[PDB]
Design an enzyme around this catalytic site. Structure first.
Site: not given
Ligand code: PLP
Ligand code: PLP
Ligand code: ICC
Ligand code: ICC
Lengths: 426, 422
Positions: B109, B136, B224
């Site tokens: 990621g 994050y 995300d």
């Protein structure tokens, strides 16, 4: 409808480094198998990542057993055995001392970045020495000190074929180093990044004795010496580690590509004090995952079991012999260089001027591909053929590869400029 | 023949360690990790969500073994390969999608988020970014880069400027945009459930509204879903709960079901703007690709989003019963098999119980349960088990969790101190 067309429709160009319409559906040994069933000999070994070739039984056995019973998926929030065993096995092979520890990553890019960030964190010194034309990675972190970060000092590579300031010893580069270091606060540089054979510059072997001297200057100034052995690491040079040729030991070893034998795996071997200065610091979820680590261990076991450094030394002389044989027939070949199964062939417009033959190189590898040989070019002027075959490549494959290469040199003009313009390359 | 965990301390450096207790693993079977000593633990972490299919799933074993046996090369950089291509088509088939979007493959990621940001800047020239405080997006220089409009995440449990609706956050956003030149912000990075913030589901409608404002300003919406995507939320993609479709989707963790594999689904124009631009040698490698395919195939075949929805409610229902017996529990939140439990010192004050949270997971570890904490405050237990976890595995982990709450005092401050954690 064809696999290559589908690739162009499904996958963005952003990560593409295409030189010809190679479209693969299988692999066996040092051969790739195109959609139709045509077999090609792979002299690139995926830039050296396919250390043991394709479908190697030790990779197959290792990865199958790991997938069937995996020790979790991470080294982050858990210790797992495959990673710990691989960490000790890598530790054993490194002298020394030591007092050294392992950091695991997915790639050479994330490992060079980790090495850097750990150094700056552990020491406070953010300055970096690196070489012009250096390839340390394609992440924002690892590109910061690759060739074209603050306190980045770039030095010419000690290139025998094109000596800096026309001084063949390299003494001028060490003199430049010295001038550069005193223009900068004492103790401000934390690290020197070194490729023992420079991959992206054109598979450049530096002049004998230069790296040892360079390291001595570095050690005298407090600077940690980082050996980036992602491309040329682990047996490829004809020794387990490429620095074994250069009469020095780096403080830090960066490994990648061929380490995973086909799976994403890298590693930093660095003094304990560098890797223990922080926790939860440079981390990604699947780092040290058991399947990747299992393959990594199968690479190391196979290196030891098959004496692959000795093999790479043998097969590399065979390959270079044959390439010299080609030079005696093809004027484009200006320079053959390399160690073990890391070899470079520079193509030039004239053997005296040594001017880069970019257009002929592109046509060469395209034609080579059409004939059944996978080889890519590299280098500043796009004129350097790069040979980094599976380490398990047979002599019969190499002879066949040489005949196809000879044929590709002779049949190069067949390739139209519009065929070549389909493929952006670098 | 030392202790596995002690061998770890001597070989592997601290730099990447996120350790909360001496877990040392030698095996795995379904949703169970097998420690060196042969004790099975129920994994509620699923390796932070990566082990989407659990451990030793037949589909992963079959696909990985076959891929290893006959690998279509090792890269997608320099060759096209069938597994990577087949998986790309499959991901595009799961998105809407058709002819407008392309795929970029990564390892993680962090690199996928980094690629998205670099590609956007390159394609559009707009380097300005909007992101959420506590977000994050990965742990590399490139993914920790995000010039920057930082917004509070709209947390129903902790509102911004005394507005539980979240409308004051949309108002702040409007102000920041007006304050800076039009066309200077290229991208908005959103988690549709905020992971590091402590598994926060935003208030209904907020993200849909947020997406409108962005499109109104020519700003690309990047969703995300590395933690919370791929069947985990009860739908295949988490944005389906949110009444909008993002311009760019980032996928990772569970995608490889144990191998490293990430992906960016982005407009063709963003991904075709340059070549040899964002790349690493083993990207699109066929062994990871085949593993990605097995994951996507299993999701459809064993209807995993519906299973996640079922097992999630059953998990969160069980935790509400624990809240009746354990006052520490303040908020149970989540979608599907991505759940959070915020632990507080008072349910009205909503004051974070950090110290007690550490002991809880340490204690739960001793009992046979793997579970971790997150959040700015270190007081939210994350539940992200294999989408494969059994109904029996869930009830059993609920009893153990119950037992863990009753036995907190059994774990001291000196045991907690031996592990550096976050
Ligand atoms: C390939 C390479 C890297 C980067 O590895 P990736 O797997 O491509 O990230 C770094 N340094 C050198 C010398 C390399 O050859
Ligand atoms: C895990 C995660 C990432 C990064 O993935 P790594 O594999 O850890 O780099 C990015 N965004 C979110 C929401 C994540 O959960
Ligand atoms: O969920 C996460 C992201 C992966 C890196 C470890 C921190 N926790
Ligand atoms: O030698 C390299 C590094 C691997 C990525 C492709 C570029 N060339």
């Amino acid at each position: 409808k064809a696999l290559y067309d589908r690739d162009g429709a499904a996958i963005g160009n952003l990560q593409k480094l295409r030189f010809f319409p190679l479209a693969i559906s299988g692999g066996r040994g040092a051969r790739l198998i195109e959609e139709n069933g045509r077999e090609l000999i792979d002299l690139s070994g995926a830039w050296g990542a396919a250390s043991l070739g394709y479908g190697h039984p030790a990779i197959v056995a290792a990865v199958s057993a790991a997938a069937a019973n995996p020790a979790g998926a991470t080294i982050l929030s858990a210790s797992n055995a495959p990673a710990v065993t691989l960490a000790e096995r890598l530790l054993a092979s490194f002298p020394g001392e030591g007092t050294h520890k392992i950091w695991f990553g997915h790639s050479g890019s994330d490992a060079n970045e980790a090495a850097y960030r750990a150094i700056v964190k552990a020491t406070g010194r953010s300055g970096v020495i690196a070489f012009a034309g250096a390839y340390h990675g394609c992440t924002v972190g690892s590109m910061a000190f690759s060739g074209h970060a603050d306190g980045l000092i770039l030095l010419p590579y000690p290139d025998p074929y094109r000596p800096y300031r026309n001084d063949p010893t390299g003494d001028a580069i060490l003199t430049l180093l010295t001038e550069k270091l005193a223009a900068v606060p004492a103790g401000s540089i934390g690290a020197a990044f070194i490729e023992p054979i420079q991959s992206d510059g054109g598979l450049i072997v530096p002049p004998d004795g230069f790296l040892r001297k360079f390291a001595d200057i570095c050690r005298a100034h407090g600077i940690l010496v980082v050996c980036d052995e992602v491309k040329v690491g682990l047996a490829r040079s004809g020794r387990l580690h490429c620095f074994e040729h250069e009469g020095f030991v780096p403080d830090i070893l960066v490994l990648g590509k061929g380490l995973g034998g086909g799976l994403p795996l890298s590693a930093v071997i660095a003094p304990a004090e560098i890797l223990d200065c922080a926790s939860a610091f440079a981390m990604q979820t699947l780092h040290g995952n058991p399947i990747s680590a299992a393959a990594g261990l199968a690479v190391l076991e196979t290196i030891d079991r098959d004496d692959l450094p000795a093999m790479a030394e043998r097969k590399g002389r065979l390959l270079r012999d044959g390439l010299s044989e080609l030079a005696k027939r093809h004027p484009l070949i200006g320079d053959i260089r390399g160690r073990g199964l890391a070899c470079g062939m520079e193509l030039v417009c004239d053997r005296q001027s040594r001017e880069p033959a970019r257009a002929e190189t592109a046509k060469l590898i395209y034609r080579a591909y059409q004939l059944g040989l996978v080889v890519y070019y590299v280098g500043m002027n796009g004129n350097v053929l790069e040979f980094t075959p599976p380490l398990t490549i047979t002599e019969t494959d190499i002879h066949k590869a040489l005949d196809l290469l000879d044929r590709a040199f002779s049949e190069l003009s067949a390739v139209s400029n519009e065929e070549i313009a389909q493929f952006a390359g670098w």
